[PDB]
């Protein structure tokens, strides 16, 4: 304890103050050593919780050491240079002020050295040769802190302020400058409503080159965070208890598809453990692995949770086109949001760009249609209104036969120009041997042997 | 006080800030107590940038900014006689003819940039508040106050955009070099202005008796010989304020160079990316070789 630096700094100031009252005169001796204890500035900013960050406290230590040593060493130069040398009977004074010593030492250790003011006392020069060596040894020691300043100060993301009165989704899993691109172009589309919910992203590895440019292009509605979806600590800071849904993305270009989608199941587990009632939308690379989602006790697809199986839709659209060509490009245009475009030319694409403007929508039909047969309603939708009806829910009934009658509160599915038009369908009022599988859904036969079909 | 020259700028800046604050407060609070914005805004980006229609106003703003600088170099060369000079001739009038144009150009941008609080705190807005008001005070006394007229140098930062509109600086790498180069010559000429202002007019504590007779070109030289770490000390700052500013500029200069020392990615790494045009000499013919070359 006696050899602690804050103990030494008290011994070099308290005793001479109690001598000073005898003569009633202020000895300017080692009273500048009080500057040697503002090193403790980090702790008080750390107790007010202002300097909470583990990286930033190092910067405040290094900064405090420099201003404390600068003010202290200027004190020694003042003391030694103002009161001359013994050898000249102290006749060798240079009339210097403390602020000129603070300046001199700064102009010196910057290697500028104007020489308009400089140390004349032989002791002062001796100290200056020590402080030049000491200063350059000190900077050579602390030149390796670019790990703090350049390497780690750039670690952004760890709070996500929750703006009340809005709602949002969470996107996570596998994100890259291509993987988010087809999503963001359609999610932030101009032809939907002011549905301003997109405010977050979350995955461990930091963003790269033009992904940050793509985020800056949508500065108001991205708000990325570093953090891993397996920690309930990270989920808590992203405010996922408040989120409307959690969209999970997976790389279809994987080296082993049956490893990625299995990994992706436990991303669903981690989320459902933290919070059971949140919507999950996810993508699966293989088909068989889709069964696993039903095991998770709080997965209920009747509340909206669903898994987009890439192999199931990919081979499905292709299979469908073997009955009628172009049906793959037909369906793939009904889901992407797309503006109507005018072309003045008579080229083939003039008529095609009318067709592509058609997205698919759903809406509860008016009470005025209840008790009619499906074909009768579908005529009126296309002749009286300008909407084509595909199907009704009776649990997903597509193009029902005339023998089927519409009841109250049924959804219709429509393929029409813009979401704002479908409401016409709701407001309308007057105006004017074994051969199959166990369910009979598919064809079946007794198992063959591969030698019989090569 | 200083004949309220400085006060005219300082009051019109903070007065506008308080107006916007009060207006934005009351426009909300009145709900709790119980147009040209585009058709002129578009001209403020289409006559001046993006579609390059009509004549680039940014180009006139740039040329008149340099004109005001040249007038500042002339005015600061004279020994500040004040009582009588040739300013009755063009010198003062032509500065007033640029200041009216700047006032109108500021007038156009005031309606444009939606949330006026953020527009008021734009650096090119601040640089206009620190020059336009004291010029209209200057006509009362008929004398040129050398105050913050050197801040006109703070807006030649926009030199990249006009070289980018003439399509001279078409290259995505080379525009970074022109930005970094422009920031250095703009900050150098600006900081030399502060040293001139503070060092020529002495300290309050000595009743302003503490003058050192310095010219703007010696301040441009001093600051260059200082931040190069040479420091001959044949000319240096004597005023106690001047020394204080010099200790700030030495720290600021070395912090700035440490920040921009990581641009070797531009200069050494990417300036060497040759090849992207192949001029076609007519009257000859040629082959193309490609695939795998070593």
């Amino acid at each position: 304890f006696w050899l602690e630096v804050n103990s030494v700094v008290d011994f070099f100031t308290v005793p001479p103050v109690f001598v000073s009252v005898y003569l009633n005169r202020s000895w300017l001796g080692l009273r500048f050593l009080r500057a040697l204890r503002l090193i403790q500035f980090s702790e008080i900013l750390q107790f007010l919780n202002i300097l909470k960050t583990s990286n930033s406290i190092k910067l405040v230590n290094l900064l405090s050491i420099f201003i404390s040593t600068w003010l202290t060493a200027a004190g020694f130069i003042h003391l030694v240079e103002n009161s001359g040398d013994p050898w000249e009977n102290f006749q060798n004074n240079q009339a210097l002020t403390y602020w000129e010593c603070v300046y001199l030492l700064m102009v010196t250790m910057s290697t500028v050295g104007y020489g308009d003011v400089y140390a004349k006392t032989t002791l002062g020069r001796l100290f200056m040769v020590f402080f030049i060596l000491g200063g350059l040894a000190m900077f050579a020691s602390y030149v390796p802190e670019i790990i703090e300043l350049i390497g780690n100060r750039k670690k952004y993301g760890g709070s996500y302020s929750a703006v009340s009165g809005r709602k949002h989704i969470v996107v996570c899993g596998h994100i890259t400058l291509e993987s988010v691109s087809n999503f963001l172009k359609d999610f932030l589309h101009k032809d939907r409503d002011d549905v301003n919910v997109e405010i977050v992203f979350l995955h461990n590895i930091s963003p790269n080159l033009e992904l940050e440019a793509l985020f800056k292009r949508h500065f108001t509605q991205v708000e990325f965070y570093q953090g891993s979806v397996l920690n309930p600590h990270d989920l808590a800071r992203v405010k996922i208890e408040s989120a409307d849904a959690c969209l999970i993305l997976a790389n279809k270009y994987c080296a082993d598809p049956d490893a990625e989608d299995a990994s992706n199941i436990m991303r669903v587990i981690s989320i459902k453990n933290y919070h059971p009632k949140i919507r999950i939308i996810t993508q699966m690379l293989q088909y068989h692995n889709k069964a696993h989602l039903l095991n998770i006790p709080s997965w209920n697809w009747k509340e909206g949770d669903d898994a987009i199986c890439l192999a199931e839709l990919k081979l499905g659209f292709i299979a469908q086109s073997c009955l009628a060509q172009g049906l793959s490009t037909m369906l793939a245009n009904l889901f992407s949001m797309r503006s109507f475009i005018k072309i003045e030319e008579d080229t083939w694409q003039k008529y095609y760009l009318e067709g592509v403007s058609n997205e698919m929508y759903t809406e509860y039909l008016s009470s005025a249609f209840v008790g009619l047969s499906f074909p009768t309603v579908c005529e009126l939708c296309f002749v009286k209104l300008k909407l084509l009806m595909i199907a009704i829910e009776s649990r997903i009934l597509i193009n029902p036969g005339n023998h089927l009658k519409i009841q109250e509160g049924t959804l219709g599915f429509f393929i029409a120009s813009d979401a704002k038009e479908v409401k016409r369908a709701f407001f309308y009022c007057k105006a004017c041997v074994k051969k199959y599988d166990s369910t009979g859904m598919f064809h079946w036969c007794a198992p063959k042997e591969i030698e019989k079909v090569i | 006080m200083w004949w309220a020259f400085l006060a005219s700028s300082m009051v019109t800046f903070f007065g506008g800030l308080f107006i916007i604050l009060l207006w934005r407060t009351l426009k909300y609070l009145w709900t709790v107590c119980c147009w040209m914005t585009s058709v002129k805004d578009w001209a403020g980006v289409m006559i001046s940038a993006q579609t390059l229609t009509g004549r680039v106003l940014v180009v006139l703003v740039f040329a008149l900014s340099i004109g005001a600088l040249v007038i500042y170099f002339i005015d600061s060369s004279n020994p500040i006689e004040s009582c009588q000079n040739f300013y009755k001739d063009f010198t003062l009038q032509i500065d007033m003819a640029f200041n009216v144009f700047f006032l109108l150009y500021f007038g156009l941008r005031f309606i444009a940039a939606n949330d006026k609080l953020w527009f008021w705190l734009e650096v090119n807005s601040v640089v206009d508040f620190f020059t336009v008001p004291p010029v209209f005070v200057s006509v009362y006394l008929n004398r040129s106050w050398l105050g913050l007229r050197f801040l006109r140098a703070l807006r030649l930062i926009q030199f990249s955009e006009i070289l980018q509109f003439l399509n001279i600086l078409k290259t995505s790498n080379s525009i970074k070099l022109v930005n970094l180069l422009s920031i250095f010559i703009s900050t150098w000429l600006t900081a030399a202005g502060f040293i001139h202002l503070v060092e020529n007019s002495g300290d309050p504590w000595e009743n302003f008796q503490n003058n050192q007779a310095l010219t703007y070109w010696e301040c441009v030289y001093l600051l260059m010989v200082t931040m190069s770490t040479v420091g001959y000390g044949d000319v240096y700052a004597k005023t106690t304020l001047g020394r204080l500013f010099m200790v700030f500029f030495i720290l600021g200069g070395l912090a700035m160079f440490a920040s921009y020392v990581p641009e070797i990615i531009e200069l050494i790494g990417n300036r060497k990316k040759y090849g992207g045009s192949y001029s076609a000499v007519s009257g000859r013919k040629h082959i193309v070789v490609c695939g795998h070359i070593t």
Binding site: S164, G165, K190, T220, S339, I341, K342, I343 | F14, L17, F18, L21, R24, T25, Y28, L29, T31, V32, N114, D115, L117, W118, L121, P204, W205, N207, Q209, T240, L244
Partner: protein, 212 residues
């Protein structure tokens, strides 16, 4: 070839405040800090010289003698543009007996005049010909020579520094009390007001938006 390209459609409002809220708060803090720092500087920078004038006392002294010394002191006279030429003036000494110190002391116009010549009680505005300097001393000398000892008068003095020099005027006007405690304080007050005012508008804005 490239169709109609795209469409000109955009509808945004920076939400309400974000970049303006950050900048206005930052500016308020900068004005707060630079107010406190400017007071901290103008403190020990101004108080160190101002204490020396403040320490000087006042009294009501009387003339004791008036003399011509003979020594012709050099002075610099300007010609309106950079003449470093010089001329000379005769030294006059006016002694006073101080009303409190009762000691012989020389009078001096101001500490500037005292520091530039401690052996003479006046310095003329220096001019080209010896005659103009001589008359400019005589004219000031006359005003004391016709009022020796009659009408005691207000004068300034400092025994701590020197018992034998007396001043007709103070060296500092009231700029210190009027400008040192004012402009950094006003700078701090405007900073505090802009922070408080902005936090009022920020906190009120959400409460007004929730009223629907």
């Amino acid at each position: 070839k490239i169709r109609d390209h795209d469409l000109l459609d955009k509808r945004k409002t920076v939400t309400a405040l974000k970049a303006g809220e950050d900048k206005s708060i930052r500016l308020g803090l900068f004005l707060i800090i630079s107010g406190v720092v400017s007071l901290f500087i103008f403190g020990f920078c101004w108080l160190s010289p101002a204490l020396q004038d403040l320490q000087a006392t006042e009294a009501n002294c009387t003339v004791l003698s008036v003399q011509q010394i003979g020594e012709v002191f050099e002075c610099t006279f300007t010609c309106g543009a950079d003449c470093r030429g010089t001329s000379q003036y005769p030294c006059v000494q006016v002694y006073v007996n101080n009303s409190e110190s009762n000691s012989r002391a020389l009078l001096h116009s101001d500490e500037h005049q005292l520091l530039t010549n401690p052996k003479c009680s006046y310095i003329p505005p220096c001019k080209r010909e010896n005659q103009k300097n001589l008359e400019s001393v005589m004219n000031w000398q006359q005003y004391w020579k016709d009022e020796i000892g009659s009408q005691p008068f207000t004068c300034y003095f400092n025994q701590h520094q020197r018992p034998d020099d007396v001043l007709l005027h103070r060296t500092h006007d009231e700029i210190v009390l009027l400008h040192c405690f004012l402009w950094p304080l006003v700078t701090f007050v405007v900073g505090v007001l802009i922070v408080v005012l902005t936090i009022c508008a920020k906190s009120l804005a959400v409460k007004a938006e929730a009223m629907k």
